[PDB]
Amino acid sequence: AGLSFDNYQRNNFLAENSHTQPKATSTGTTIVGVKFNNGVVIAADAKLHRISPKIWCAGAGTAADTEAVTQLIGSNIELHSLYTSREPRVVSALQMLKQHLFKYQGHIGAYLIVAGVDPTGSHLFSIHAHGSTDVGYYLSLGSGSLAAMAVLESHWKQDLTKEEAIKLASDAIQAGIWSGSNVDVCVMEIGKDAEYLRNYLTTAVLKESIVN
């Protein structure tokens, strides 16, 4: 049951014997996070995912795996919110996502930055595909992460307001620019709905037959 290995050996002979195995689509582009005043911004240059209304992610690595785990854990978070009668905590999703990424030993190639608001406050974490975890006021993943982190550190200060967090988010993304290529952002603020912002920046012979 679950993800099967039926054609694993069948495809181990196809690639060996000269069929080009189709390319899995990858989002290698910059993703960022901002634990801004009274909330948390995340952004990416289709790429921002929901585990619940107040908890969102940006994904890097294999596109299907970032969608697939965030949708599986979003199901478990929804069921747990129905079971406990309480809004789903970011630490609970982080535990599920990180514990699910560990069961799959990094053969599920999702690298993920997780953010949200819950009855405790506003939280920001990131999980690597082998199921190991970071925490910080600001995080970045993907190829532009060196340059993005230099910009995040150079301008972050406590009591960063929405607008300033959204500027820093967008500048740490545009510092990753010189698939993808313009900003999507979501802003989670402790009293309020997650604000999601898309794109913030006679010839031939004919015969014919009718069909149903």
Binding site: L3, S4, F5, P22, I108
Partner: peptide, 12 residues
């Protein structure tokens, strides 16, 4: 198609 994750269908 995702179900076949470790040995997929060679398709588009």
């Amino acid at each position: 198609l995702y179900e076949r994750r470790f040995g997929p269908y060679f398709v588009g």
